[PDB]
Design an enzyme around this catalytic site. Structure first.
Site, PDB file in Angstrom:
ATOM      1  N   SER A  20       0.812  -1.215   0.000  1.00 28.92           N
ATOM      2  CA  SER A  20       0.000   0.000   0.000  1.00 28.92           C
ATOM      3  C   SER A  20       0.847   1.268   0.000  1.00 28.92           C
ATOM      4  CB  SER A  20      -0.933   0.026   1.207  1.00 28.92           C
ATOM      5  OG  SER A  20      -1.600   1.273   1.267  1.00 28.92           O
ATOM      6  N   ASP A 138      10.306   5.552 -13.465  1.00 23.48           N
ATOM      7  CA  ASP A 138      10.288   5.067 -12.075  1.00 23.48           C
ATOM      8  C   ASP A 138      11.152   3.830 -11.764  1.00 23.48           C
ATOM      9  OD1 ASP A 138       9.539   5.562  -9.533  1.00 23.48           O
ATOM     10  OD2 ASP A 138       7.395   5.130  -9.813  1.00 23.48           O
ATOM     11  N   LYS A 140      13.051   1.598 -10.333  1.00 24.03           N
ATOM     12  CA  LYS A 140      13.770   1.604  -9.057  1.00 24.03           C
ATOM     13  C   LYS A 140      13.610   0.243  -8.379  1.00 24.03           C
ATOM     14  CE  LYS A 140       9.694   3.769  -7.031  1.00 24.03           C
ATOM     15  NZ  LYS A 140       9.131   4.372  -5.781  1.00 24.03           N
ATOM     16  N   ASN A 143      10.405  -1.264  -7.262  1.00 20.00           N
ATOM     17  CA  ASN A 143       9.360  -1.652  -8.186  1.00 20.00           C
ATOM     18  C   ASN A 143       9.593  -3.045  -8.754  1.00 20.00           C
ATOM     19  OD1 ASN A 143       8.520   1.690  -9.416  1.00 20.00           O
ATOM     20  ND2 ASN A 143       9.197   0.943  -7.407  1.00 20.00           N
ATOM     21  N   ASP A 160       4.411  -0.010 -11.623  1.00 21.83           N
ATOM     22  CA  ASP A 160       4.428   1.340 -11.062  1.00 21.83           C
ATOM     23  C   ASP A 160       4.507   2.387 -12.154  1.00 21.83           C
ATOM     24  OD1 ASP A 160       4.073   2.349  -8.551  1.00 21.83           O
ATOM     25  OD2 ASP A 160       6.106   1.881  -7.831  1.00 21.83           O
ATOM     26  N   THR A 179      12.150   9.704  -6.878  1.00 25.87           N
ATOM     27  CA  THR A 179      12.876   9.447  -5.629  1.00 25.87           C
ATOM     28  C   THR A 179      14.310   9.977  -5.537  1.00 25.87           C
ATOM     29  OG1 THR A 179      11.639   7.486  -4.860  1.00 25.87           O
ATOM     30  CG2 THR A 179      13.958   7.662  -4.206  1.00 25.87           C
TER      31      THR A 179
END
Length: 276
Positions: A20, A138, A140, A143, A160, A179
């Site tokens: 989550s 994204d 990373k 993920n 993601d 990030t």
């Protein structure tokens, strides 16, 4: 456009809560006429066109319409879309490997040979995309996910697709976030772009996947960035001694300031290190 507006409950029976984020939760789930264990993702919208908690339609239908277009190995696919008042729920290809970064976690790093095996998996996974004008942005560790933490040799996935955007042309908009440890310079310095950017994340991952030691991370947020922008990596002895100069070369050409002067998938998918 509209997808599905009813109660999945009469069709899907949820279960465990996998993950989550900040505006979503991942819960396993079967079907009524298949037993094909999935897991619907629900991402929190916004009450009014000016909420601070959740996410707008544009992003939803976007991540959707960007996904609803895919179909390939190391990259999760899309079954259908189930929408109800509160949220839009992504009926994603169930995955459960979690963070490869984790599965091997207890095991610090790996072994270049056994290593690349995984490297060469995303490299192939990102590729398909690239040539499809759809960077991810994204990419990373967090993920990256395996399809069975049990199969002898794992097949990872890709997900993601938040930052992900058609780079076709795109009114490469929305900015939004990234990030503090893996976004490519361009992001750190007034939002450029590129699938050439994805090979920056990737040049990162490939260095961590084999060292258990972030190259730029700093004690504080800002302070780190101060590290990407300049691109000031360093092979740590206690942290790299047993590393192939060749292996090195790789990541190295991946941590370069000017994009164009940085490698790309194609090139990267042929570097001496990935010489099948």
């Amino acid at each position: 456009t509209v997808f599905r507006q009813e109660n999945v409950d009469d069709y899907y029976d949820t279960g465990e809560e996998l993950g989550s984020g900040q505006f979503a939760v991942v819960k396993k789930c079967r079907e009524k006429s298949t037993g094909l264990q999935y897991a619907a993702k629900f991402i929190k919208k916004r009450r009014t066109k000016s909420s601070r908690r959740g996410v707008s339609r544009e992003d939803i239908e976007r991540e959707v319409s960007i996904l609803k277009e895919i179909q390939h190995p190391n990259v999760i696919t899309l079954h259908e879309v189930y929408e109800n008042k509160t949220d839009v729920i992504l009926i994603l290809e169930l995955v459960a490997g979690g963070e490869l970064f984790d599965f091997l976690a207890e095991k610090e790093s790996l072994t270049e040979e056994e290593a690349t095996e995984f490297l060469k998996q995303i490299l192939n996974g990102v590729y398909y995309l690239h040539s499809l004008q759809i960077a991810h942005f994204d990419l990373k560790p967090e993920n990256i996910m395996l399809l069975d933490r049990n199969v002898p040799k794992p097949r990872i996935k890709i997900i993601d697709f938040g930052l992900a955007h058609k780079i076709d042309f795109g009114n490469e908009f929305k900015n939004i976030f990234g990030t503090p440890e893996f976004v490519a310079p361009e992001i750190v310095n007034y939002e450029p772009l590129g699938l050439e950017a994805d090979m920056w994340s990737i040049g990162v991952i490939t260095y961590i996947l084999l060292s258990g030691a972030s190259p730029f991370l700093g004690d504080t947020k800002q302070e780190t960035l101060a590290n990407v922008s300049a691109v000031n990596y360093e092979f740590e002895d206690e942290y790299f001694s047993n590393t192939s100069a060749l292996a090195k070369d790789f990541i190295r050409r991946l941590l370069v300031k000017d994009p164009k002067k940085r490698m790309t998938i194609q090139d990267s998918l042929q570097h001496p290190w990935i010489k099948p």
